[PDB]
Design a protein around this ligand. Structure first.
Ligand code: GNL
Ligand code: GNL
Lengths: 562, 563
């Protein structure tokens, strides 16, 4: 109820001429590849009344329906039935419905070659786009001449018996039924493990400070964790493996609407001794582990974007700053002290094996000077970098994440896989496509996971799960970057089109891995070669002969035939 | 001549040898001007049609397509046409243009089939070669094994040709020897169609001179530039073109086309507060088009350019600066009054003021009203035009008003506008799947457009791009926006399109319908007027699904030619 909301005003006026051949309200299955605009009729010639889906046991699969009306429709609703198949059933508890709601977005930089740098919103276009999966609001009133998408997620349980299942989606308005769309689902005799058991390394950096701000509650209070639980569950259920921690004040110098505070207390006592306390850090880590996010903790950062380190100075009873750089003796002395304490603490908690000291796009020289400090503190501290490819760092880094344009050699990837290291890629503001801006094509998000599979990478990294702007449900623009850069989940614990398509891609990554292990076990070199040539579609420079949407849909069909 | 020869793009569709196994020898036949014959398949013709019966008025241009398809390589394919003889009287072969109907890359409507608007990545759509370019320049072509090639034949019938039946021969040669002699019969009736200069039909196809200077890499408005444009724009004059496009400021459409329109007027702000304006480009362009026969109207774009940022040469900084200002602002009014008052004097001095329209493209109501006030304050007699949405409020203020096809003026509104000497037309753009002139549109759609003007008692038709060429217009007609072919209808080398030739035939029939009604009103002929009018009801934009554009057009041609 407190999560109900109003969308922003459409910056595009509705054109009555576009709506003149719409005589009655129209209800049809649509496509999960499409963001239907609010102010235009759905681009669908013909009412498609049936939907054929194919899926594995355990898989989450989705479909979009669409409603558009020349008249006002009050209290629009859709329920879905059980899915029946002779004697066996998929309960409707396993089916989430939501209204695909509209958020303000912009566009790429004026040149079309990137989306990096500061922005005044006045200098760019402004539109509404369908991105939010609103599973909370039970009904909506559609105005005259407007369109509204409906997202339907089907969670197929593990125990479900292989066969063809039939079901009904019932759209109502004003208290009366407008249409019964049919839904067929072919469940195959192959099982997809739960999210907890997926190999895919998904790192989407979390900002707890954005949630405390938006809801105006005290950080790390009961209320704060209660609001974050379903929100972060979305991340766990997409296969999230990495817990973000800020072990010092402002690791990214407040580049986001909400700055990261320190989850560690840095106390310099007046007698030369230090006192460190990890109570916040521990509560945050324990909380995320509880949700199923447990493979890695990434601590930002020893090389924060501004080289100014906050500490509580007891002598003056105040916050002071140490200005110090990697390569300075004072920098080393300051960090050795903390890291040696942090190391003991982490071993006592049983988290040391998984805890990485983490850096974001720092230069070569600084990384080398920083590594020396780290190794001197503890030889077994794990380290991560999301940044530029450097042959010099391949052995020192346990999680190495590289821009999409750059590549590890297959030799380098095998050695890294063999040694239990993690090897991923990212996109950021640089790359017009593929990306997860609110205006990006939905299939782009899915494409990202397939690209991991083509490159034999472990997964994918993006720098902002939920670094919300002021009013994230209404307006996704920020003072920097393309709109949507800073988040992919919304308040109320509402998923995005982007995150659901990414999750589907991740599921197919897992399927590709399971099929290859089976085909290596049998003698099946025909199947391996075929899968591998489907995967060559996911090259960042073959997007102009084969579009992301075409690529994805081709490859889905292929894997689902095996 | 030689510098206009070119290679087509690679076919995105592979040729299938199985489709060609029942083709034993090369085949030559008359075809249809309603059809774009695919390159990679044999012509869909199960019998060689050796004769072609055409009917035409004196003065009329009439066409026919022949088709050649071959299982083997044919070197130096050529076709000449003879004189057409009829007892003692003759139509010289100088009056007959032949061309190879050549292939251009195209796409398709938006995925839904309901429009063709919006930005596009070419990866997201189909890609095919389609027959559109009438190549009258290249004298021969070498056909590869398993391919089809259409040939367009335009017969310009002179005024004063004597009424009767004319016989003639089309001779197709290859490798230096004759493959076939197709026969061509032409029934010339005892009714005469005036030259293009005398057609009532108001055809406005906006011209882009900047595309021609770019593509040939020559200096804009130089001798070479005008020489390349002369035959190119002749195609427009000879289709009945009435309107000269002028850009009186920098980028009136904010570079929506591959080549942006630059300003044909120099806007110099001197450092002492005075302005200097020079119209030398504007004048040379206008004089040049008037010389070709395009003289009824000049349309100057625009006071409401698509981005409200007006360029001027700032002398004080010796640089280009921009004024950001909107209709309804005092600064906007001051900036334009100054220019328009100078422009008005200039236009009167040249004798062009009566025909010069300040022109706008799809702008809102409020902005048009605020802009009109500025215009009227500059000069009360400035004429104004709008291609856009129907608004009752603007009917008196606009001397040329062009409305989307989906919207309609009342017959009362059309009579008042005709009575006052105002012009009243319609357009299609990217919105309308049919009828249109995309490179994939059915050829008859182009002709249907002119008949639709005749059904609605409109003066003519407007389209927004005669020649706003993409990078390689002969090869690939796709653009970063819209259906392929939206941005142009004539090609480099001054080559017509299937689209423009069919549109021209439709325009000719518009003129014939007008002449027959004036005769039938003058006689007592109520039977004929009622019949013509019921033929015309076929050209309704929502009767296309019971009667196809091709069927409509051919039906109506027969009917008019019986009278
Ligand atoms: C791994 C990354 N690190 C940087 C982040 O801190 C943000 O600045 C982001 C903006 O798109 O760009 C890159 S992505
Ligand atoms: C009268 C017209 N004006 C507009 C033009 O400037 C182009 O944008 C065109 C694209 O199809 O659409 C409409 S048609």
């Amino acid at each position: 109820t407190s999560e109900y909301y109003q969308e922003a005003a459409n910056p595009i006026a509705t054109n009555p001429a576009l709506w003149a051949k719409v005589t009655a309200p129209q209800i049809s299955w649509g496509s999960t590849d499409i963001r239907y605009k609010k102010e235009e009729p759905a681009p669908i010639h013909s009412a498609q009344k049936s939907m054929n889906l194919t899926a594995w046991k355990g898989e989450k699969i989705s479909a979009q329906l669409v409603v558009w009306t020349p008249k006002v429709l009050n209290d629009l609703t859709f329920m879905v039935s059980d899915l029946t198949s002779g004697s066996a059933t998929i309960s409707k508890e396993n089916i989430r419905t939501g209204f695909v709601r509209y958020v303000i977005t912009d566009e790429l930089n004026k040149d079309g070659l990137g989306a990096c740098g500061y922005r005044n919103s006045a200098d760019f276009d402004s539109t509404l786009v369908a991105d939010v999966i609103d599973h909370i609001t039970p009904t909506l009133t559609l105005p005259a001449n407007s369109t509204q998408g409906g997202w339907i997620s089907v969670n197929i349980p593990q125990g479900t018996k292989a066969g063809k299942y039939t079901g009904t989606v019932t759209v109502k308005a004003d208290g009366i039924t407008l249409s019964e769309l049919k839904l067929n689902l072919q469940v195959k005799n192959r099982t997809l493990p739960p999210p907890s058991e997926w190999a895919f390394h998904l790192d989407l950096w979390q900002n707890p400070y954005a949630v405390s701000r938006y809801y105006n509650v005290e950080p790390f209070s009961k209320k704060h964790f209660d609001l974050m639980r379903p929100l972060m569950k979305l991340y766990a259920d997409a296969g999230g493996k990495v817990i973000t921690a800020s072990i010092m004040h402002k690791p990214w110098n407040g580049q986001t609407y909400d700055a990261f505070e320190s989850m560690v207390t840095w106390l310099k006592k007046a007698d030369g001794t230090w006192y460190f306390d990890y109570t916040v850090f521990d509560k945050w880590v324990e909380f995320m582990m509880d949700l199923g996010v447990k493979k890695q903790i990434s601590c930002y950062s020893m090389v924060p974007w501004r080289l100014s380190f906050q500490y509580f100075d007891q002598a003056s009873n105040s916050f002071k700053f140490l200005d110090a750089k990697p390569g300075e003796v004072a920098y080393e002395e300051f960090w050795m002290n903390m890291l040696q304490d942090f190391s003991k603490h982490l071993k006592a908690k049983g988290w040391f094996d998984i805890t990485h000291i983490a850096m974001d796009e720092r230069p070569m020289k600084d990384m080398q000077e920083t590594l020396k400090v780290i190794r001197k503190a503890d030889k077994d501290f794990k380290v991560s970098l999301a940044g530029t490819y450097h042959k010099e760092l391949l052995d020192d880094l346990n999680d190495y994440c590289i821009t999409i344009a750059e590549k590890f050699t297959p030799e380098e990837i095998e050695a890294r896989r063999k040694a239990g290291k993690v090897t991923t890629y990212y996109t950021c503001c640089t790359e017009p496509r593929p990306n997860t801006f609110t205006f990006s094509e939905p299939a782009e998000a899915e494409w990202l996971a397939w690209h991991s599979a083509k490159e034999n990478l472990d997964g994918y990294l993006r720098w902002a799960l939920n670094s919300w702007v002021k009013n994230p449900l209404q307006d996704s623009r920020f003072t920097a970057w393309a709109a949507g850069d800073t988040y992919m989940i919304y308040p109320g614990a509402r998923s995005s089109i982007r995150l659901e398509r990414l999750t589907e891609g991740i599921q197919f990554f897992e399927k590709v891995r399971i099929l290859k292990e089976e085909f290596e076990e049998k003698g099946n070199k025909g199947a391996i070669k075929n899968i591998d040539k489907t995967l060559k579609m996911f090259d960042e420079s073959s997007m102009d002969k084969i579009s992301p949407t075409t690529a994805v849909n081709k490859a889905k069909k292929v894997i689902n035939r095996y």
